[PDB]
Amino acid sequence: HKNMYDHTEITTDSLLALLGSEKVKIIDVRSADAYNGWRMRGEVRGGHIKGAKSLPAKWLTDPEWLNIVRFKQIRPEDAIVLYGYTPEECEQTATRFKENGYNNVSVFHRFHPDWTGNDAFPMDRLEQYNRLVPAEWVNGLISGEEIPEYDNDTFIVCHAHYRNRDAYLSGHIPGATDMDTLALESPETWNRRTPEELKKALEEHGITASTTVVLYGKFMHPDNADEFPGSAAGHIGAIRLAFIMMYAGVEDVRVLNGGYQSWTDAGFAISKDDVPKTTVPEFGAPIPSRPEFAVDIDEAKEMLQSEDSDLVCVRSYPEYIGEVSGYNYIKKKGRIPGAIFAECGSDAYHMENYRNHDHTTREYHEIEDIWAKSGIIPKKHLAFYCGTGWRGSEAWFNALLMGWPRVSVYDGGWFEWSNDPENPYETGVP
Ligand SMILES: C[N+](C)(C)[C@@H](Cc1cnc[nH]1)C(=O)O
Ligand SMILES: [Cl-]
Ligand SMILES: [Cl-]
Ligand SMILES: [Mg+2]
Ligand SMILES: [Mg+2]
Ligand code: NA
Secondary structure, rough: OOOOOEEEEHHHHHHOOOOOOOEEEEEEEOOOHHHHHOOOOOOOOOOOOOOOEEEOOHHHHOHHHHHHHHHHOOOOOOEEEEEEOOHHHHHHHHHHHHOOOOOEEEEEOOOOHHHHHHOOOOOOOOOOOEEEEEEHHHHHHOOOOOOOOOOOOOEEEEEEEEOOHHHHOEEOOOOEEEEEEEHOOOOOOOOOOOOHHHHHHHHHHOOOOOOOEEEEOOOOOOOOOOOHHHHHHHHHHHHHHHHHHHHHOOOOOEEEEEEEHHHHOOOOOOEOOOOOOOOOOOOOOOOOHHHHEEHHHHHHHHHHHHHOOEEEOOOHHHOOOOOOOOOOOOOOOOOOOOOOOOOOOOOOOOOHEOOOOOEEEOHHHHHHHHHHOOOOOOOOOOEEEEOOOHHHHHHHHHHHHOOOOOOEEEOOOHHHHHHHOOOOOOOOOO
């Protein structure tokens, strides 16, 4: 007897006995930040039931909901077990599955406090989840409230954009200041600036090595027909700047997960003030403190020859096979020989394969699993790259979050590689 609105409860003991079953899909309907590990109700152990997939209940208003589910490989013949902080949070999702041809749907009532509270019940979390912050954390920070995973006394919220102050002036997080990505990377090479330039730029924007910097950007629907589509890919830009700042030596860098969209979806107030900078006189550390995060072309060439190492191409497929360059300022088309392809998404200004529709990072197990199928694994020194390094930086950041011990960005990318006509390249379908 199928019942659309009254959902069978699954007990703790029954769920424990099913933890290894390939026919069971355990679905966490909490926010992706809680799933990653954030202790959003004060639970002592954060994260998810081991083996659970992420399907935030917020996504029920997405017209593509069923396609998300199918793309996650959750199928009608699976036994679906839903949980949240409360069973009541699962009710609408359970009904949505049942309305869409899933007849085996249960609700687990005792994730919190029973599962989270007992250390024999397996949980998992994104190892460095505290670098990828929810909007509630940022709001607590700017409010001076006590927040978890923070013991500094100095912070700055930084709104990234590429040559587009309107992205900030049209609406930003209260108190935040804007940073043009041109402040930290050069329009000549599209590589990070020299250490002396980085020092000066960081100081002028009010940033010391011991400042907690919270970076985010605004997605404004990049259109490849505009002169500068990157002016609209603000949150990729934010993660690119996070890379450069962490390389430079800012000890504590955070990224707002999903960027500006997450702030407004949470319903917080926004500001249009043009906030003046408060400069600081001394960065306070030698730049770069973390040079290993950045790989230039001679090291990249060595990595292509080493068994220990690989370059990871985070470009679109039409770029990879040489149909297009990806960019209106790159004429050469083709790919670096010997790199492992890890398709970014549709084009140079979209990261669909690394993100959810709401711009939060894609469920990290899915990224991990796809990467492993190509031999992109943490025991290697990996250098992520793309055309000029923005998408490479976002892939790199995803691997950093997983705790991977040797990940870098090959900054120069296809731009630098193809600018030397002596460098070999491939084209066409492999
Ligand atoms: C390095 N700039 C800022 C010129 C890039 C940034 C970028 C966005 N997606 C890939 N790269 C551009 O806007 O094409
Ligand atoms: Cl973006
Ligand atoms: Cl390439
Ligand atoms: Mg897990
Ligand atoms: Mg570069
Ligand atoms: Na290699």
